Write an enzyme that holds these catalytic residues in place. Structure first.
Site, PDB file in Angstrom:
ATOM      1  N   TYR B  27      24.513  18.415 -27.322  1.00  0.00           N
ATOM      2  CA  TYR B  27      24.408  16.722 -26.898  1.00  0.00           C
ATOM      3  C   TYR B  27      24.929  15.614 -27.517  1.00  0.00           C
ATOM      4  O   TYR B  27      26.208  14.059 -27.459  1.00  0.00           O
ATOM      5  CB  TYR B  27      23.449  16.127 -26.701  1.00  0.00           C
ATOM      6  CG  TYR B  27      22.529  16.784 -25.442  1.00  0.00           C
ATOM      7  CD1 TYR B  27      21.689  17.666 -25.589  1.00  0.00           C
ATOM      8  CD2 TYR B  27      22.693  16.043 -24.174  1.00  0.00           C
ATOM      9  CE1 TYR B  27      20.950  18.820 -24.620  1.00  0.00           C
ATOM     10  CE2 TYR B  27      21.869  16.610 -23.099  1.00  0.00           C
ATOM     11  CZ  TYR B  27      20.888  17.818 -23.433  1.00  0.00           C
ATOM     12  OH  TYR B  27      20.566  18.828 -22.568  1.00  0.00           O
ATOM     13  N   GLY B  29      27.724  13.643 -28.562  1.00  0.00           N
ATOM     14  CA  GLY B  29      29.896  13.390 -28.194  1.00  0.00           C
ATOM     15  C   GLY B  29      30.342  13.883 -27.155  1.00  0.00           C
ATOM     16  O   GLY B  29      29.666  14.265 -25.921  1.00  0.00           O
ATOM     17  N   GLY B  31      29.684  16.700 -25.007  1.00  0.00           N
ATOM     18  CA  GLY B  31      29.077  17.488 -24.479  1.00  0.00           C
ATOM     19  C   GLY B  31      27.524  17.207 -23.637  1.00  0.00           C
ATOM     20  O   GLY B  31      28.374  17.321 -22.264  1.00  0.00           O
ATOM     21  N   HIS B  47      19.404   9.301 -26.608  1.00  0.00           N
ATOM     22  CA  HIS B  47      20.932   8.065 -26.581  1.00  0.00           C
ATOM     23  C   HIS B  47      21.224   8.219 -24.917  1.00  0.00           C
ATOM     24  O   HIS B  47      21.207   6.980 -24.400  1.00  0.00           O
ATOM     25  CB  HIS B  47      21.869   8.239 -27.716  1.00  0.00           C
ATOM     26  CG  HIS B  47      22.844   6.524 -27.002  1.00  0.00           C
ATOM     27  ND1 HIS B  47      23.982   7.295 -26.779  1.00  0.00           N
ATOM     28  CD2 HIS B  47      22.871   5.644 -27.565  1.00  0.00           C
ATOM     29  CE1 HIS B  47      24.461   6.380 -26.679  1.00  0.00           C
ATOM     30  NE2 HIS B  47      23.981   4.907 -27.537  1.00  0.00           N
ATOM     31  N   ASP B  48      21.352   9.270 -24.272  1.00  0.00           N
ATOM     32  CA  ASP B  48      22.378   9.732 -23.187  1.00  0.00           C
ATOM     33  C   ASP B  48      21.081   9.859 -22.139  1.00  0.00           C
ATOM     34  O   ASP B  48      21.375   8.571 -21.212  1.00  0.00           O
ATOM     35  CB  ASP B  48      22.576  11.343 -23.049  1.00  0.00           C
ATOM     36  CG  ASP B  48      23.909  11.918 -24.144  1.00  0.00           C
ATOM     37  OD1 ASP B  48      24.411  11.088 -24.763  1.00  0.00           O
ATOM     38  OD2 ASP B  48      23.913  13.191 -24.076  1.00  0.00           O
ATOM     39  N   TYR B  51      21.033   5.756 -21.940  1.00  0.00           N
ATOM     40  CA  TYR B  51      22.512   5.627 -21.333  1.00  0.00           C
ATOM     41  C   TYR B  51      21.845   5.542 -19.753  1.00  0.00           C
ATOM     42  O   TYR B  51      21.899   4.832 -18.837  1.00  0.00           O
ATOM     43  CB  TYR B  51      23.162   5.672 -21.768  1.00  0.00           C
ATOM     44  CG  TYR B  51      24.495   5.134 -22.861  1.00  0.00           C
ATOM     45  CD1 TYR B  51      23.621   4.233 -23.768  1.00  0.00           C
ATOM     46  CD2 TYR B  51      25.405   5.353 -22.825  1.00  0.00           C
ATOM     47  CE1 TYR B  51      24.061   3.672 -24.621  1.00  0.00           C
ATOM     48  CE2 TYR B  51      26.373   4.550 -23.778  1.00  0.00           C
ATOM     49  CZ  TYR B  51      25.173   3.953 -24.885  1.00  0.00           C
ATOM     50  OH  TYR B  51      26.024   3.042 -25.670  1.00  0.00           O
ATOM     51  N   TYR B  64      28.164  -6.110 -26.083  1.00  0.00           N
ATOM     52  CA  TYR B  64      26.699  -6.805 -26.346  1.00  0.00           C
ATOM     53  C   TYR B  64      26.734  -7.862 -27.381  1.00  0.00           C
ATOM     54  O   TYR B  64      27.463  -8.255 -28.165  1.00  0.00           O
ATOM     55  CB  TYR B  64      25.618  -6.049 -26.193  1.00  0.00           C
ATOM     56  CG  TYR B  64      25.958  -4.933 -26.809  1.00  0.00           C
ATOM     57  CD1 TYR B  64      26.293  -4.569 -28.310  1.00  0.00           C
ATOM     58  CD2 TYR B  64      25.584  -3.913 -26.715  1.00  0.00           C
ATOM     59  CE1 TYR B  64      25.942  -3.643 -29.016  1.00  0.00           C
ATOM     60  CE2 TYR B  64      26.311  -2.607 -27.143  1.00  0.00           C
ATOM     61  CZ  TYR B  64      26.162  -2.414 -28.356  1.00  0.00           C
ATOM     62  OH  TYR B  64      26.427  -1.433 -29.670  1.00  0.00           O
ATOM     63  N   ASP B  89      22.105   1.486 -28.425  1.00  0.00           N
ATOM     64  CA  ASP B  89      23.136   1.707 -29.884  1.00  0.00           C
ATOM     65  C   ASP B  89      22.279   1.912 -30.972  1.00  0.00           C
ATOM     66  O   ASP B  89      21.802   2.591 -31.863  1.00  0.00           O
ATOM     67  CB  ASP B  89      24.213   1.691 -29.676  1.00  0.00           C
ATOM     68  CG  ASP B  89      24.769   1.157 -28.424  1.00  0.00           C
ATOM     69  OD1 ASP B  89      24.467   2.877 -27.836  1.00  0.00           O
ATOM     70  OD2 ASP B  89      26.203   0.965 -28.680  1.00  0.00           O
TER      71      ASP B  89
END
Lengths: 122, 122
Positions: B27, B29, B31, B47-48, B51, B64, B89
């Site tokens: 996951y 980067g 991937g 994080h994916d 998002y 932000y 993040d």
């Protein structure tokens, strides 16, 4: 997903994404601000905005269907979203290949000290 | 945006740390499929998903507001989706930092073949 976008990129540009576009420019890498530095960089910004148009699936992880056919990339899906992500990745890999002739290593890790100016807008 | 996320990483783990996450696991980067391989990888999976939960906007391009206060990342006054994106993040950078002792080099640059499991569900 990004593994597939990375395949498309190797196939169309001869470059392994993780060692090249992934660290490149203000948009291809960990960027999202400042001016697109060159054509490669612009292709990536276009692909960001493309991803931007995707609402119902996660473009980073949605696994779509594609193959290479005569040098072309063919997106094979029905689910409209899968297909829309695939088409984003396709166009950008095609755009990267069209501009590899001006790939410039000097844009590798450029976002550490640059990309501080007006950003590109979609 | 990723320029900011990269500084949150660098500010928490040290200079140049962001480049350790360019491609790691299934996951982090470039991937996005299969089973996360380890805690660091799961940081990226979460994080994916974080998002993917962001509606109406584009985290890659969002700018932000945040700062470091006493060594720690603090999300500023962000309205609407910006708050959500900064927090995605923040959490992930903090996750990387807290798991830097299980970071394993052998997971950098996996090819998708190592990630052919049905992708973990958000």
């Amino acid at each position: 997903n990004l593994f597939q976008f990375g395949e498309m990129i190797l196939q169309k540009t001869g470059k392994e994404v993780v060692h090249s576009y992934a660290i490149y420019g203000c948009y291809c890498g960990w960027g999202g601000q400042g001016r697109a530095q060159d054509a490669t960089d612009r292709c990536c910004f276009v692909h960001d905005c493309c991803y931007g148009t995707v609402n119902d699936c996660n473009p980073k992880t949605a696994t779509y269907s594609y193959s290479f056919e005569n040098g072309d990339i063919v997106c094979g899906d029905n689910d409209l979203c899968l297909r829309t992500v695939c088409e984003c990745d396709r166009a950008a890999a095609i755009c990267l290949g069209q501009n590899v002739n001006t790939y410039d290593k000097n844009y590798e890790y450029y976002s550490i000290s640059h990309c501080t100016e007006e950003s590109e807008q979609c | 945006n990723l320029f900011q996320f990269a500084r949150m990483i660098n500010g928490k783990l040290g200079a140049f740390s962001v480049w350790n996450y360019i491609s790691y696991g299934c996951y982090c980067g470039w991937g996005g499929q299969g089973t996360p391989k380890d805690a660091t990888d799961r940081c990226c999976f979460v994080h994916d998903c974080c998002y993917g939960g962001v509606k109406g906007c584009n985290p890659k391009l969002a700018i932000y507001s945040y700062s470091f206060q006493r060594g720690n990342i603090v999300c500023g006054r962000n309205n609407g989706c910006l708050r959500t994106i900064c927090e995605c993040d923040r959490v992930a950078a903090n996750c990387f930092h807290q798991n830097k002792n299980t970071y394993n080099k052998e997971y950098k640059f996996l090819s998708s073949s190592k990630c052919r499991q049905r992708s973990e569900q958000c």
